[PDB]
């Protein structure tokens, strides 16, 4: 029964943190769990309590005004919106620009480590395609662990439907060329399961997730927001609506610097009859004249500690914020762009009546003020958020899915 | 069913690390887990992935220990009726309460009670000398249980104490633990109960065969190594070529054995003359006071014992649970030169009697004993065989995962 389990993620702390509860659930059941990424992530892994395995070298994706253009927009992965050439082009661009940059810097070293350590199971972040390659080379079972509304597997479904419509001579697959190429050098074939896993462990509540033909194991999202301590000032319950605003390095590197500044956001919120807590990086802190009387500025505060009894979370649609607000039943305001699943994170809540999404480009002082007022005053938002909270709470925990993962590993692995 | 669970530990990283797998098992089942200690431990807690709650102020225990560890009154290694008059066992409780338990706990107990009042945990899980924990629990009606890294000399010495107490006339009955903890509880309007001394139940990481039998509700749990923040270095891939021998000296080793006995530099030189591969984990001051490094020896600041000990032949250490337990789950024979401090001697003796390892008093350690002991643990296969039986015993114990529902049921039974 006792397994070696290799977690693999691209070098994003935000992605890593989504994997920590499941990793610990498996370790707590007696399995050995190692987490592999590029050296830049080693320090972050080590502060999760989990054993880090540095692999390969660091990449230049972070250096490479905003990241929204039609070819990077996977927010509406629908047949009706994709000709063959459109979906093919999306796979070509995503493979060349994102997936290869994230993964090629470490894939061979990951295959090597897998050969040495011989994991029974590899659990991979959904864009960490180095993971299933390494698994397949050593015959390990492997599964995606999702932080995402599954635009990746859904766009792939669209892609395969269009591929099947093409004459044989015009059939082309950038994912098969890339991953099949690497697998070929180790004497292995490509299979579609290297793209979507042998199964999918999904932290997204079923009602908000795109329906797909996958072996799907739902698991409850449990907040992990990185290294955290409870400050003294949390004891003071607020006395009026508490509104939390997070801008990270994700926010800035992707939204750019072209839209409404955080300084204007603070000033708007500073005029309102609310308590404001703003988690800001040191550059956006300095670039800021006066701090309003109703506002506290922090470098970091643990969202899981802060969001109980909060009224609103304002953020860009990353899963840590989205999920932590969701489990606390806090309405969310998501001014964002069509990058990764961020727009879907916003629209899913918008359609459910649990929060508000707006395009970052349309954000003004008036929209900010009115949106916050609406999420505080209109009780239908809290009620819809509370239904989603309850849906998450009905989902089996990491603990509960451990035996399922054990059985699936026995079935699919060597 | 969803619980708030407060872990409480004295500010020792070695103690904290023993609690991490159970804490994560409970978090993985959907419960909220916070870990409280003095501010000095905050950084250590944060690197476990668990949420830290700094409480109270730091204490001076380490300064008072170094400025003054093994004497008859601090020796709880043989907690037996036959070796304790009333006056002997009373004196042991008086000194341990005044010197160790109060120093560790009084600096944070009131702030811990305050936090418990605010947060309202359903359950408090406490390190076995962190008596602030059960006080805070009792004040808010939380269920509470000890989580043991120790051969349970604490509860066994208490049993001896209570047997002798019962033999005294009622006017001569005196209990330093009841005075101390009952005093604090009294200020919050609560009574003392014996369950604040041994918990409502005991979650025990020591294999049953090596643990002292007691009148406790006992929940055995498998020890899973956690050795602090860790990564796998490249040089581990190289399987060894000859017996690998690992030596740890920590700041526990130094502060408690500190400077009467065979120096670490002499230990390195002895091992340096043998046909072995040596890895020595040493603090930065031990490293400086060292002329040459032998050819067969690698010196590290830190290396994860869970990664290092598979295939290793011997671990040499002072009897701390992290080392003991991690060697045990890897079936690695142990050589334990140590003193009668905490349960360290029992950690050594337990393995010695089982034929799985060797213990010697630190004061008797020479180059010849070191060399001969290592040779014996490498060459005589009966050591590996006995170690392997203990490994198998641990492996038959239910995991943290498996005991989660037991802890849930016990909390429902005993709590609010
Ligand atoms: O003050 C803060 C800032 C961030 N976070 C969490 O830390 C992680 C980082 O997420 P994000 O997507 O913002 O990316 P980052 O730029 O922090 O890498 C997520 O769990 C956030 O919700 C938090 O708990 N408190
Ligand atoms: O190189 C090292 C040094 C220590 N440890 C572990 O770190 C923890 C703390 O060490 P110890 O019990 O020696 O006491 P300390 O010296 O840290 O007080 C235990 O799990 C040890 O077994 C380890 O894995 N590798």
Instruction: Name the residue among A208, A216, A236, A239 with its Cα closest to residue A384.
Output: A208
The Cα–Cα gap between B346 and B359 comes to 9
Tokens 């955080």 belong to A262
Contacts for A162 with CB less than 8 Å, ≥ 6 apart: A79, A82, A83, A84, A87, A88
Instruction: Name the residue among A217, A242, A239, A271 with its Cα closest to residue A397.
Output: A217
The SS3 of residue A117 is helix
The Cα–Cα gap between B98 and B82 comes to 25
The SS3 of residue A152 is helix
Cα(B48) to ligand 1 centroid in Å equals 18
CB contact under 8 A, A25 and B401: yes
Judge contact between A48 and A128, C-beta under 8 A.
no
Burial letters A80-102, b for 16+ CB under 10 A, else e: eebebeebbebbbebbeebbbbb
Contacts for A345 with CB less than 8 Å, ≥ 6 apart: A149, A317, A318, A319, A322, A334, A336
Residues of B with CB under 8 A from a CB of A: 2, 20-22, 24-25, 27-30, 34, 42, 45-54, 118, 222, 224, 226, 229-232, 237, 304, 306-307, 395, 399-402, 404
The SS3 of residue A411 is helix
The SS3 of residue A221 is coil
Cα atoms in the 13 Å half-sphere on the side-chain side of A368? 25
The Cα–Cα gap between B80 and B159 comes to 9
The Cα–Cα gap between B244 and B235 comes to 13
Give the DSSP letter string of A223-236: ---SS-B--GGGGS
Going B253 to B257 to B259 to B261, the CA torsion angle's sign is negative
User: Contacts of residue B394 in chain A, CB cutoff 8 Å?
Assistant: none
In Å, what is the CA distance from B369 to each residue of B276, B324, B342, B366? 16, 20, 24, 5
Count CB atoms within 10 A of the CB of residue A168: 5
Ligand nearest to the CA of A12: 1
Give the DSSP letter string of A16-53: HHHHHHHHHHHHHTT-EEEEEE-GGGHHHHHTBTSEEE
Contacts for A273 with CB less than 8 Å, ≥ 6 apart: A240, A241, A294
Residue B236: closest C-alpha in chain A: A116
Q: Which residues pair with A242 in a beta bridge?
A: A275
In Å, what is the CA distance from A135 to each residue of A55, A127, A143, A404? 15, 15, 10, 19
**Are β-strands B244-248 and B218-220 bridged in parallel, bridged antiparallel, or unpaired?**
unpaired
**Are β-strands B32-37 and B4-8 bridged in parallel, bridged antiparallel, or unpaired?**
parallel
The SS3 of residue A75 is coil
Give the DSSP letter string of A312-381: EEE----HHHHHHHHHTT--EEEEE-SSTTHHHHHHHHHHHTSEEEEEGGG--HHHHHHHHHHHHH-HHH
Count CB atoms within 10 A of the CB of residue B73: 12
Burial letters A105-120, b for 16+ CB under 10 A, else e: bbbbbbbebbeebebb
CB contact under 8 A, A47 and B46: yes
Written as six digits, the tokens of A114 are 């897998």
Tokens 């890897």 belong to B330
Closest atom of ligand 2 to B325 CA is 22
Contacts for A61 with CB less than 8 Å, ≥ 6 apart: A98, A101, A102
Residue B228: closest C-alpha in chain A: A49
Judge contact between B317 and B337, C-beta under 8 A.
no
Written as six digits, the tokens of B120 are 């309202």
Count CB atoms within 10 A of the CB of residue A259: 16
Going B327 to B331 to B332 to B333, the CA torsion angle's sign is positive
Q: Which residues pair with A145 in a beta bridge?
A: A201
The Cα–Cα gap between A310 and A320 comes to 16
Tokens 């009373």 belong to B90
Distance in Å from the first CA to the final CA of chain A = 13
* Cα A198–Cα A204–Cα A206 angle in degrees, nearest 5: 90
The Cα–Cα gap between A17 and A45 comes to 9
Going A76 to A79 to A82 to A84, the CA torsion angle's sign is positive
Containing H/E element for A142? strand A141-146
Q: Considering CB atoms only, which of B24, B53, B402 is closest to A230? A: B53
Tell me if A392 CB under 6 Å of ligand 1: no
Containing H/E element for A216? strand A216-218
The Cα–Cα gap between B153 and B158 comes to 8
Instruction: Name the residue among B194, B49, B31 with its Cα closest to residue B119.
Output: B31
Closest atom of ligand 2 to B302 CA is 1
Instruction: Name the residue among B358, B352, B351 with its Cα closest to residue B325.
Output: B351
Cα(B149) to ligand 2 centroid in Å equals 14
CB contact under 8 A, B51 and A304: yes
The SS3 of residue A89 is helix
Instruction: Name the residue among B335, B403, B413 with its Cα closest to residue B22.
Output: B403
Resolution of the experimental model, in Å, one decimal: 2.6
Containing H/E element for A122? strand A121-124
Written as six digits, the tokens of B129 are 């000398």
B106: buried, middle or exposed (CB in 10 Å: 19+, 13-18, 0-12)?
Answer: middle
Judge contact between A384 and A397, C-beta under 8 A.
no
Tell me if A302 CB under 6 Å of ligand 1: yes
Q: Considering CB atoms only, which of A54, A235, A398 is closest to B28? A: A398
Secondary structure of chain B in HEC code, one letter for each residue: CCCEEEEECCCCHHHHHHHHHHHHHHHHCCCEEEEEECHHHHHHHHCECCEEEECCCCCCHHHHHHHCCCCHHHCCCCCCHHHCCHHHHHHHHHHHHHHHHHHHHCCCHHHHHHHHHHHCCCEEEECCCCCHHHHHHHHHCCEEEEEECCCCHHHHHHHHHHHHHHCCCHHHCCCHHHHHHHHHHHHCCCCCCCHHHHCCEEEECCCHHHCCCCCCCEEECCCCCCCCCCECCHHHCCCCCCCEEEEECCHHHHHHHCCCCCCHHHHHHHHHCCCCEEEEECCHHHHHCCCCCCCCEEEECCCCHHHHCCCCCEEECCCCHHHHHHHHHCCCCEEEEECCCCCHHHHHHHHHHHCCEEEEEHHHCCHHHHHHHHHHHHHCHHHHHHHHHHHHHHHHCCCHHHHHHHHHHHHHHHCC
Judge contact between A25 and A328, C-beta under 8 A.
no
Closest atom of ligand 2 to B253 CA is 16
Tokens 């462990």 belong to A201
In Å, what is the CA distance from A253 to each residue of A68, A69, A258, B145? 12, 15, 11, 48
């Amino acid at each position: 029964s006792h397994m070696r389990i290799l977690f693999a993620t691209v070098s994003e702390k935000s992605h890593l943190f989504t994997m920590v509860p499941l990793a610990w659930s498996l370790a707590a059941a007696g399995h050995e769990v190692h987490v592999a990424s590029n050296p830049a992530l080693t320090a972050s892994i080590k502060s999760t309590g989990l054993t880090a395995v540095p692999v390969g070298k660091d990449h230049n994706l972070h250096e490479m005004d905003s990241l929204e253009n039609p070819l990077s927009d996977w927010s509406t992965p629908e047949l009706d919106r994709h000709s063959w050439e459109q979906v093919l082009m999306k796979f070509k661009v995503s493979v060349m620009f994102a997936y290869q940059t994230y993964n090629d810097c470490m894939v061979h070293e990951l295959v090597d480590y897998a050969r040495h350590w011989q994991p029974d199971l590899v659990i991979w972040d959904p864009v960490t395609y180095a993971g299933p390659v390494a698994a397949r080379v050593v015959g390990a079972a492997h599964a995606r662990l999702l932080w995402c509304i599954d635009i990746y597997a859904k766009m792939r479904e669209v892609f395969l439907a269009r591929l099947a419509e093409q004459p044989e001579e015009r059939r082309e697959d950038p994912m098969a060329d890339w991953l099949g190429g690497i697998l070929g050098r180790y004497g292995h074939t490509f299979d579609e399961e290297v793209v979507v896993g042998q199964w999918t462990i999904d932290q997204i509540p079923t009602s908000l997730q795109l329906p797909l033909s996958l072996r799907r194991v739902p698991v409850r999202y449990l907040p992990h927001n990185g290294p955290s301590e409870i400050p003294d000032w949390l004891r003071e319950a607020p006395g009026r609506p508490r509104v939390v605003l997070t801008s990270g390095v994700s926010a800035r590197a992707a939204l750019g610097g072209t839209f409404m500044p955080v300084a204007d956001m603070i000033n708007t919120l500073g005029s309102m009859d609310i308590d404001v807590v703003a988690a800001l990086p040191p550059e956006e802190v300095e670039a800021l004249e006066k701090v309003p009387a109703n506002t506290r500025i922090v470098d970091f505060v643990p969202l899981h500690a802060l969001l109980p009894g909060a009224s609103v979370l304002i953020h860009h649609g990353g899963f840590g914020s989205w999920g932590t607000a969701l489990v606390n039943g806090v309405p969310q305001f998501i001014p964002t762009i069509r990058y990764a699943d961020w727009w879907n994170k916003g629209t899913s809540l918008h359609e459910a009546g649990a929060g508000l999404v707006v395009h970052a480009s349309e954000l003004t002082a008036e929209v900010l003020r009115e949106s916050v007022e609406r999420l505080v005053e209109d009780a239908s938002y809290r009620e819809a958020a509370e239904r989603l909270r309850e849906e998450n709470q009905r989902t089996p925990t990491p603990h509960d899915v451990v035996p399922v993962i054990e059985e699936l590993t026995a079935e699919h692995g060597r």
